[PDB]
């Protein structure tokens, strides 16, 4: 270490890990360079590291990895005739140089769009050359998602490897592999969204706010930890996320490790759930810790009434350090309720703060704040209720028919939203319902928050680049804790004038009967949205008349001898019979 940084990295990571991350880091700076140029780089940088491992005292093995990596970047021939002013970065000395590079990372690289080949082609390529097949895609994905934390992209890639291993040698390859690839896309996109949103919220609402979130989240997970310990961890976590949000891989990676090193050295004073994690190699340590089970909460804890309502010096302890008092509230409440969403805890916190502001200025303070815990009852109520009604609805309808209810619901509220956006969000919102409703009671709200936070921002980002309704603009710019209830408060837009008829949008062709089940579902769900937008004032019964008449139709023509003639003449009368009903 420090004698040869590059030799130390290599030893800690291993050759295989080393060459994987470097390909990632190279594909994340030079997004336009072809695969094989990157290969040649990764090969040159690894063989070099080897010499340093064998002989740390060698030629320039004492340089920082920041210098080595930069030197390699400015090797690339058409740096100027391809990446433009990025070549100018090479004239700058190292501290400034890397910053110049980060500033030229493109989230909109304007690359094409990865097509997923046939399972046959995939499994053949995978077998006939794993190395090239896998690293080509690692490269192809990393270049499209720069800023995506490199070691995280690596963990997904390893999960792609097992999937391709188990399934290519299966009876029905396609039926084993396709659902996994889809799950992996969804988790990976959800990963990058959660990273994106954390930096955005930090940039928008501030450090103190992030800290409030932190205390909440941490006390839930490490309830046996003392407040002084949770408080330091909150401070430490804020530092690593702040720095990790600057965008540089080595700064982030080293901060994450130190924090993993600390925690693991103090598990006794943190959680009894950190044993297997703290055994893992450096690459996996913080990744493991970040997803650790909740430690069980201390046997028998007193009510919060004593320290927060009854005590003789509430208003005093509050008056000294307000944020400290408010965080202790958070601490004591979060550790007791791992079944609460973090934002909900922040609302009870917000409410406790307000009443304290009013009530501590009273001639007899305890009088006016003695009932404050009675306002928490309806704030806790609202989320708890919403999962019951939604999970019930789902449990008796199944995922696909459950998304179709959301489809109609949200098209009726915000019909100005583009059709594919409505299909994408309503389908997504159904999956978090299929994910979290399978968890038991006390895990539902924390889970629903986790994926709602993703799907909600996803939609906000579209609407930011393309706004079409102000009540959505308002729900997206409202506070952190107000975001979701704002959306739940969306009402049916009955001032929306019906979209005009277009026989194309309701013309169905015989290709549907062969299309993949996912592919096929989008088609129908696209038409459903369009059915609502054309006739939003129709009843549940009117709607279900048409959705049934259509099911019959497709059943008939998809088993006909001449399927294309059937889809033409029968869809011709299907549309007419239906216009007539909703006329
Ligand atoms: C401290 O100031 C800086 C902030 C940043 C950005 C950044 C900036 C943002 C923001 C979000 C982000 C986010 O970008 C990424 O965007 C991608 C958008 O498409 C999805 C698919 O994938 C996203 C990445 O996964 C996400 O991680 C940050 C995470 O890693 C960074 O460093 C990113 O929302 C508000 O403004 C860079 C800097 O370098 C000069 C800074 O100095
Ligand atoms: C610039 C190319 C070489 C990059 C080598 C460093 C790659 C990440 C180091 C892994 C540290 C992981 C720390 C953690 O997340 O817990
Ligand atoms: C969107 C389809 C339903 C998904 C499952 C039900 C979600 C109910 C809302 C949960 C809200 C938790 C976040 C919060 O308390 O602010
Ligand atoms: C604003 C665009 C309309 C399409 C999606 C609407 C999303 C509403 C989010 C509601 C999340 C909680 C579900 C619920 O409150 O029942
Ligand atoms: C205006 C004429 C429309 C006639 C056809 C409307 C069909 C709307 C989509 C039907 C979706 C059915 C859902 C399903 O069966 O999976």
């Amino acid at each position: 270490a420090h004698k040869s940084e590059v030799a130390h990295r290599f030893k800690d990571l291993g050759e295989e890990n080393f060459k994987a991350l470097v390909l990632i880091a190279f594909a994340q700076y030079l997004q336009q360079c072809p695969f094989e140029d990157h290969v040649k780089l990764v090969n040159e940088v690894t063989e070099f590291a080897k010499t340093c491992v064998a002989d740390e005292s060698a030629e320039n093995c004492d340089k920082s990895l920041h210098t080595l990596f930069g030197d390699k970047l400015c090797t690339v021939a058409t740096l100027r005739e391809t990446y433009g002013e990025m070549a100018d970065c090479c004239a700058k000395q190292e501290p400034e140089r890397n910053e110049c590079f980060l500033q030229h990372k493109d989230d909109n690289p304007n690359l094409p769009r990865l097509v997923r080949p046939e399972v046959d082609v995939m499994c053949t390529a995978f077998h006939d050359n794993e190395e090239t097949f896998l690293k080509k895609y690692l490269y192809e994905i990393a270049r499209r998602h720069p800023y995506f934390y490199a070691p995280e992209l690596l963990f997904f890639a390893k999960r792609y490897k097992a999937a391709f291993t188990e399934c290519c040698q299966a009876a029905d390859k396609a039926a084993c592999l396709l659902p996994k690839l889809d799950e992996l896309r969804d988790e990976g996109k959800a990963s990058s969204a959660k990273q994106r949103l954390k930096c955005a919220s930090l940039q928008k609402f501030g450090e103190r706010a992030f800290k409030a979130w932190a205390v909440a989240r941490l006390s839930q997970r490490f309830p046996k930890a003392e407040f002084a310990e949770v408080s330091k961890l909150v401070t430490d976590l804020t530092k690593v996320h702040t720095e990790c949000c600057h965008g540089d891989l080595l700064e982030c990676a080293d901060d994450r490790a130190d924090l993993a090193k600390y925690i693991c050295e103090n598990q006794d004073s943190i959680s009894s759930k950190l044993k297997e994690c703290c055994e893992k190699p450096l690459l996996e340590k913080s990744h493991c810790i970040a997803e650790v089970e909740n430690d069980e909460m201390p046997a028998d804890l007193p009510s919060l009434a004593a320290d927060f309502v009854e005590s003789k010096d509430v208003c005093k302890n509050y008056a000294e350090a307000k944020d400290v008092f408010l965080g202790m509230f958070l601490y004591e409440y979060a550790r007791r309720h791992p079944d609460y969403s973090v934002v909900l805890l922040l609302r009870l916190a917000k409410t406790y703060e307000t009443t304290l502001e009013k009530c501590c200025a009273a001639a007899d303070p305890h009088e006016c704040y003695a009932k404050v815990f009675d306002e928490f009852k309806p704030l806790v109520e609202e989320p708890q209720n919403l999962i019951k009604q939604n999970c019930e609805l789902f449990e008796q309808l199944g995922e696909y028919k459950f998304q179709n209810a959301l489809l109609v619901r949200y098209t009726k509220k915000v019909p100005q939203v583009s059709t594919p956006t409505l299909v994408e969000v309503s389908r997504n919102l159904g999956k978090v319902g299929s994910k979290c409703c399978k968890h038991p009671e006390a895990k539902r709200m924390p889970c629903a928050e986790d994926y709602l936070s993703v799907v909600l921002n996803q939609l906000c980002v579209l609407h930011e680049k393309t706004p079409v309704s102000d009540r959505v603009t308002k729900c997206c710019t409202e506070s952190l804790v107000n975001r979701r209830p704002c959306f739940s408060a969306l009402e049916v837009d009955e001032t929306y004038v019906p979209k005009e008829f277009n026989a194309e949008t309701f013309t169905f062709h015989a290709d549907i009967c062969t299309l993949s089940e996912k592919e096929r579902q989008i088609k129908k769900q696209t038409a459903l949205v369009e059915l609502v937008k054309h006739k939003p004032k129709a009843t549940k019964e009117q709607l279900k008349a048409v959705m049934d008449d259509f099911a019959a139709f497709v059943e008939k023509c998809c088993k006909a001898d001449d399927k294309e003639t059937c889809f033409a003449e029968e869809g011709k009368k299907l549309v007419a019979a239906s216009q007539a009903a909703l006329g």
Side-chain angles (χ1 to χ4, degrees), residues 9 13 21-22 25 65 69 149 151 249-250 253 256-257 282-283 286:
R9 300 281 185 204
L13 296 167
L21 295 146
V22 172
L65 182 52
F69 193 78
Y149 186 52
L249 170 60
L250 294 166
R256 283 177 70 121
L282 295 182
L283 199 48
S286 66

Side-chain angles (χ1 to χ4, degrees), residues 102-103 107 145-148 192 195-196 199-200 203 244-247:
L102 257 13
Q103 295 183 313
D107 172 52
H145 302 268
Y147 303 141
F148 198 115
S192 198
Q195 199 187 331
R196 162 92 167 80
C199 296
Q203 192 159 355
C244 276
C245 283
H246 190 356

